[PDB]
Every structure is written in C-alpha cells, then in structure tokens.
Amino acid sequence: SKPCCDQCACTKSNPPQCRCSDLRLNSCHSACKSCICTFSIPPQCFCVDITDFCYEPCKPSEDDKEN
C-alpha cells in the first residue's frame, strides 16, 4: 500500500520537518520508520517520524467534478 497521511503538522524549519498525527489501527503507514501503538486489541498506532515533506492526504480532494 502506497504512502499517504491526512494530517501533516509541519513545523518551524528550513528545510521543513513534518509530523503526522493520523491514528491507524493494527500498524502504521508502510513507510513509517518509527511507529508506536497502544497495547490494546486492536492496537491504536501513530507514526512519530519527522520528514521534510508530507504524503498525499490519503483522502481525495473531491473538488474536481463541479464547474
């Protein structure tokens, strides 16, 4: 499954450095390097990575059909 992150909290920096807050069950983002999870079933997981870029916001923009 290809990368994507809805909420991307980029911060004060140049180049940028960003942080995703998306909650995912079972596991993180396939390209997450450091993932944390609650120890429940199903586990609630978050990516704690810090990249200088955001992945496409998972959800489509749904704004290209109506003139």
Partner: protein, 241 residues
C-alpha cells in the same frame, strides 16, 4: 490490599507464566464474544481501573479470577459493568491521562484468587531503577496472531521521565511513567493491566499499561499511565459514586 493469598514467584514478550492465582487483582476485559482485548486491576470489590484507550463500554464484561483463559474449570467471576468513567482529560492523540474507571454492577467476591491491589498516594516517590512487575495476557511474540491463555508476568525497571524522553521525546508527559527497555516488553492485549511495585510489602499500582513500540521491542521502554498523577481523580470518582 496488595497482599496476594497465593504468593507470586518472580525469576508480555520474554516474560514467564505467573504462578496461578498469584496476581489476584488482574482482571480480563472481554467483549460479548468472550474475546480478551484489554486488562484491568481491581482496586476494591466494586471498581476496576484500566486504560482509557481500551474503549470499554457497559457491553463489555470484567472477568476476575482467571489464570488459564482456555480453561472451563476455574472458578471465575464474570462481572457486568454498570458505569464507565473515562477520564475527560484523556487525549486520544497524545494518549495522555490514559485511565478509565469501571463501576461493577454487582460486587466482586474476594477470595484466594480475587482481591484488590493497593493504590499509592499522589506524593509517593517510586525511584527510577526500581524493579517492578507487569502482568497480562498480551502477545508473547509480536508476530503472533494468538495471545497466551495463561497469565504472564515480567520484572522490569522503572525509568525516569528524563531518560524515557531520550527514547520517545516529547511524547512523554507528566501523567506517564516508563518501564522496561530491559529485555522484556508489554505487548498487544496487555493494555489496561497493572504495573505494580512493592511498597511496604504491599503490591501497589504504579502504572497502567498504555503504549510503546509498535513491535513490542524489548530494547525500548513501555509507557504506562502514571497512577500517582491520576489517583486523586480515582479516589474522588469513587467518593462521588
């Protein structure tokens, strides 16, 4: 409280089986299908403490007195939940203040295998480096699709929040306490259960299993809800209800 009728023997990933009945406050949280998804601790005959993130509702059942969840011959108590008190300060994104109280609809019947853990005072000082114990039915291996049937245990040290931040950075809040990174780890299915330290000979609830490495790495610390930072809210919730 905190004095088990059956004495635990200490020599969860890389843990060991508990002596049966030796953690008498450990309860199982199970949905309507009988599936264990979280743990909890009895603090008296009428209340259980667990993690907020577990999402327990009144349709879940508290199971007390189990050692082997695959057994049908143990004398276990299946306790309905009358009311859920999820700490309103719990933040599902930061996972901070991760505590929930369950009011049982009928009182538990204490015995050799069912009793209460002690609660600390908000001022208690549990020193970094103390060896404590955590128990639960969580995965014994991250690759597993199968929790263990028998209650597991592990000994592990407490960290200072300063040292814990060296692993997890700004994720660590004052209402959190870390333990482990020592060859053992809590893992999926352990959430809500106890991290206990023996204070004046009595096992005392210092932490609630919360979160950690997504693969239950035994070289990173587990993060627990810090009970000293939440126990006045626990005591006041009980006094009001």
């Amino acid at each position: 409280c905190g004095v088990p009728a059956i004495q635990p023997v200490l020599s969860i990933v890389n843990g060991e089986e508990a002596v049966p009945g030796s953690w008498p406050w450990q309860v199982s949280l199970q949905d309507k299908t009988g599936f264990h998804f979280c743990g909890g601790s009895l603090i008296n005959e009428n209340w259980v403490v667990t993690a907020a993130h577990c999402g327990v509702t009144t349709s879940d059942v508290v199971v007390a007195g189990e050692f082997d969840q695959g057994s049908s011959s143990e004398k276990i108590q299946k306790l309905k939940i009358a009311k859920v008190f999820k700490n309103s300060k719990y933040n599902s994104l930061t996972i901070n203040n991760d505590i929930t109280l369950l009011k049982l609809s009928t009182a538990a019947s204490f015995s050799q295998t069912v009793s209460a853990v002690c609660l600390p005072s908000a001022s208690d000082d549990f020193a970094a480096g103390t060896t404590c114990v955590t128990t639960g039915w969580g995965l014994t291996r991250y690759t597993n699709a199968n929790t263990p049937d028998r209650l597991q245990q592990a000994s592990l040290p407490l960290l200072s929040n300063t040292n814990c931040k060296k692993y997890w950075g700004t994720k660590i809040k004052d209402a959190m306490i870390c333990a482990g990174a020592s060859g053992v780890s809590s893992c999926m299915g352990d959430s809500g259960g106890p991290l206990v330290c023996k204070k004046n000979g009595a096992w005392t609830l210092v932490g609630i299993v919360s979160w950690g490495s997504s693969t239950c790495s035994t070289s990173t610390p587990g993060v627990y809800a810090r009970v000293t930072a939440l126990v006045n809210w626990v005591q006041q919730t009980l006094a009001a209800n």
